[PDB]
Amino acid sequence: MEVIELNKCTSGQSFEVILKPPSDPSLEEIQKKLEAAEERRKYQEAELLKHLAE
């Protein structure tokens, strides 16, 4: 077991033990998708109010 990079201080210690070596979307696109969904809510609400008008 190799113990490496041992650092000590008043608060404690740290080290590493090795046992074996190895073998996006822009603000524009966000605003558009949020408005596309609000459009779909307004369309479904208009279809409802049109149905109630009949």
Binding site: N7, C9, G12, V17, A37, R41
Partner: protein, 437 residues
């Protein structure tokens, strides 16, 4: 010194933030009014605790936190609770009606109304930072706000703070304490939209915390207060390196560097020991070996799974209390011979150890007894994919009948986002299996 901003979203996020910040004040010696007598640099300073606390001219130490809920009653308890003086009113943001356990309602309908307000309140804390390093986001997978509004928040934070790291503390849904049937929908949807925006996420299955409270605290019917005090201890172990002197995980970047070699596979498993009941009259204090050995027992993990049938990519041991490196190596030597610990071939087999001499702090009157030494192990094992398998199975059962889909479509969401999100989870499940065959 580099500052970290914590963001608590939804009921689960806010209430867990209450637990963590109460614990932080006890550890750092900060009174509920914000005063900290041990701090001799009045009005400022770049000490390690200044990563989480700013300072006023009068000497108050204010958390670099913001609480946001789409409904007021939970944050209203913070506005009137024991630590009401601690927070500035501007960093406590409430709506008027919640997301009704509906991801699409929290992301699209209500989220759009309040996203710009939160981002400017977040901006007010960032301007107080000489070198902001990123954010710690607390939320639930199952809640409509915790899932819906967080994924919208994570999207915008990548735009406004591109060079910044973002760590998640996510509450995985558990039927024993959840009162919503659509949590698998919200969980998959929020994981798909957030995945590329989070650098490292620590999942916490409420089923695991619940059972730990029953088994090791002898609490017959654990409440959120029981769960959150225990969760705050684990969170405190994970963040302690950011708030204290040391050389391991000193910045948010080091979390991804030490625990996440693959961007998509960024869900480390957390194991914690010992959890000892404060009502236990006689208790034999456990050794370094006994508590290090407990880190490989599935009954002590934040997510129930079997690391024997997976592979490790990284492993951290974070000790609090009377611990010296000599005993850790002696304990790791014994454990390696008696347990199935297998690393992926392209990774070195080993452990990064951090020791903080201050023993774990327990809130007075809580359920946890004070111990002489404790440890939190962060291990990126592919065995955590079992939690995705469980979640995706429940998702597939409901979605096959399109049950409850109409609630989401009626909020402006398109049915395709369900399958699109599920497809991503299908890819995520496949990556884990590649790495861990």
């Amino acid at each position: 010194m580099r500052e970290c901003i914590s963001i608590h979203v939804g009921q689960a996020g806010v209430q867990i933030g209450n637990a963590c910040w109460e614990l932080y004040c006890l550890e750092h010696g900060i009174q509920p009014d914000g005063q900290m007598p041990s701090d001799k640099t009045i009005g400022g300073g770049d000490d390690s605790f200044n990563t989480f606390f700013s300072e006023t001219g009068a000497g108050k130490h204010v958390p670099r936190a913001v609480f946001v809920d789409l409904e007021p009653t939970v944050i209203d308890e913070v506005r009137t609770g024991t630590y009401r003086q601690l927070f500035h009113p501007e960093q406590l943001i409430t709506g008027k009606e919640d997301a009704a356990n509906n991801y699409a309602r929290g992301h699209y309908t209500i989220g759009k109304e309040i996203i710009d307000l939160v981002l400017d309140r977040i901006r007010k804390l960032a301007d107080q930072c000489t070198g902001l390093q990123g954010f710690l986001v607390f939320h639930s997978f199952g809640g409509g706000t915790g899932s819906g509004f967080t994924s919208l928040l994570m999207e915008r934070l990548s735009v406004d703070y591109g060079k910044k790291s973002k760590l998640e503390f996510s509450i995985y849904p558990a039927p024993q304490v959840s009162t919503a049937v659509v949590e698998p929908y919200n969980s998959i949807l929020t994981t798909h939209t957030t995945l590329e925006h989070s650098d490292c996420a620590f999942m916490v299955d409420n089923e695991a915390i619940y059972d730990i409270c029953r088994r090791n605290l002898d609490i017959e019917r654990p409440t959120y207060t029981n769960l959150n005090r225990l969760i705050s201890q684990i969170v405190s172990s994970i963040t302690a390196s950011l708030r204290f002197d040391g050389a391991l995980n000193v910045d948010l970047t080091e979390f991804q560097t030490n625990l996440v070699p693959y961007p998509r596979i960024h869900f480390p498993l957390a194991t914690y020991a010992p959890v000892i009941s404060a009502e236990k009259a006689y208790h034999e204090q456990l050794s370094v070996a006994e508590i290090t050995n407990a880190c490989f027992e599935p009954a002590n993990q934040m997510v129930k799974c079997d690391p024997r049938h997976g592979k490790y990519m990284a492993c951290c041991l974070l000790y609090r209390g009377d611990v010296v490196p000599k005993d850790v190596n002696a304990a790791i030597a014994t454990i390696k011979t008696k347990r199935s610990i297998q690393f992926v071939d392209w990774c070195p087999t080993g452990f990064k150890v951090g020791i903080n001499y201050q023993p774990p702090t327990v809130v007075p009157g809580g359920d946890l007894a004070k111990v002489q030494r404790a440890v939190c192990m962060l291990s990126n094992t592919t065995a955590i994919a079992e939690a995705w398998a469980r979640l995706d199975h429940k998702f597939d059962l409901m979605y096959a009948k399109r049950a409850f889909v109409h609630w989401y479509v009626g909020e402006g969401m398109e049915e395709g986002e369900f399958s699109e999100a599920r497809e991503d989870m299908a890819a995520l499940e496949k990556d884990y299996e590649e790495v861990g065959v």
